[PDB]
Design brief:
Layout lengths: L7 E6 L5 E7 L11 E8 L6 E2 L9 E5 L6 E9 L11 E5 L5
Antiparallel strand pairs: 1-2, 2-5, 3-4, 3-6, 6-7
PDB class: structural protein
Keywords: beta barrel, fibronectin-3 domain, myosin-binding, structural protein
Assembly: monomeric
Length: about 100
Amino acid sequence: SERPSPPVNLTSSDQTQSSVQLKWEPPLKDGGSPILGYIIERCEEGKDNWIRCNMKLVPELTYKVTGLEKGNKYLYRVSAENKAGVSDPSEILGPLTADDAF
């Protein structure tokens, strides 16, 4: 068995000043072992220090990032983990502003 490929079609909804709902679809290949769950990371748009949002692996295909600072702008990525390892991250989503749409 080997690491899975990245999650695909990472999208967002329900953007607020403190949070955003992320959603994605499973990897095209699981590497021969089932995906245990996903790892969500965020990064302030001007930096390159990615913060892991979730402790326990998310087995679902959605996750609410919280603890955002109002007015800030964030990048997001998600990775898939099986017993063999962790995929490269998905394509980067954003920048997404922590605010209320027009």
